[PDB]
Design a protein around this ligand. Structure first.
Ligand SMILES: [Zn+2]
Ligand SMILES: [Zn+2]
Lengths: 153, 153
């Protein structure tokens, strides 16, 4: 079994911890955790390409995209590998997270270990925003907090 | 060619940025970068097993030690994989790190991507202190700053 963990923080009040679990090579990855300090509602949630936070979140690069595809939702076949959709904050700004994904991995070609998890300012539109950016970025806006995904026990 | 980067933050005055470069699977990792806010002199400089910073640097675990050896210097024959030795700070509290190591790696069984780099409070005795502690951590003391090692462009 593989485990991973990520501590997210940024320039403001958003912070949280995300755990990844993957029973075997060909199993889905389960994320779970909590993020606090968010505006109420939905926020984009992506694995970005680099585990480089020398410039805070901006140095993480684009969404993790080995196959040079377009941005989509987690349920689309046409998606960046990093496209995990949205995460949902309550009225008190708390986002419990619980997600299963079979495209990211903790080993092999789609390994996200050593890369960066980012929570975003705006909802990810899942490729349906009808402008150029939706296709790149889901229009999710600024990177509110991030962390390098590391190996967990 | 492989590249990696690590931003070291702590709860105290110590911070830094470390860059890693390996030319191919067989070759040494070259480390450069800088750390500031240190007391003048030597400090343990180790890659610990887990990239987990949920409770600060302490949740990173012990030194990366796949082969279950006791602690040593990088040049000793019995050493942990994560055993990089000492890093030296000048009178102004700056360590201009430059290190070449052929035991760590940016891929494979000795891969340190997704693990935690820690700069320690005291000098590493290189496993020769003749006490229990020497044998594990080199009597390097507390964890001054740390970061998960991440994939870089
Ligand atoms: Zn995307
Ligand atoms: Zn050691």
């Amino acid at each position: 079994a593989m485990k991973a963990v990520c501590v997210l923080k940024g320039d403001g009040p958003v912070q949280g911890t995300i755990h990844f679990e993957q029973k075997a090579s060909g199993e889905p990855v389960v994320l779970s955790g909590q993020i606090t300090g968010l505006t109420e509602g939905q926020h984009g949630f992506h694995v970005h390409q680099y585990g480089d936070n020398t410039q805070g979140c901006t140095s993480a690069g684009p969404h993790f995209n080995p196959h040079s595809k377009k941005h989509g939702g987690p349920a689309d076949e046409e998606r960046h590998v990093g496209d995990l959709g949205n995460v949902t904050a309550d009225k008190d700004g708390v986002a419990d997270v619980s997600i299963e994904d079979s495209v990211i991995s903790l080993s092999g070609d789609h390994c996200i270990i050593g890369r960066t998890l980012v929570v975003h300012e705006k909802a990810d539109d899942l490729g349906k925003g009808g402008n150029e950016e939706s296709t790149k970025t889901g229009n999710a806006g600024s990177r509110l907090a991030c962390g390098v995904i590391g190996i967990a026990q």
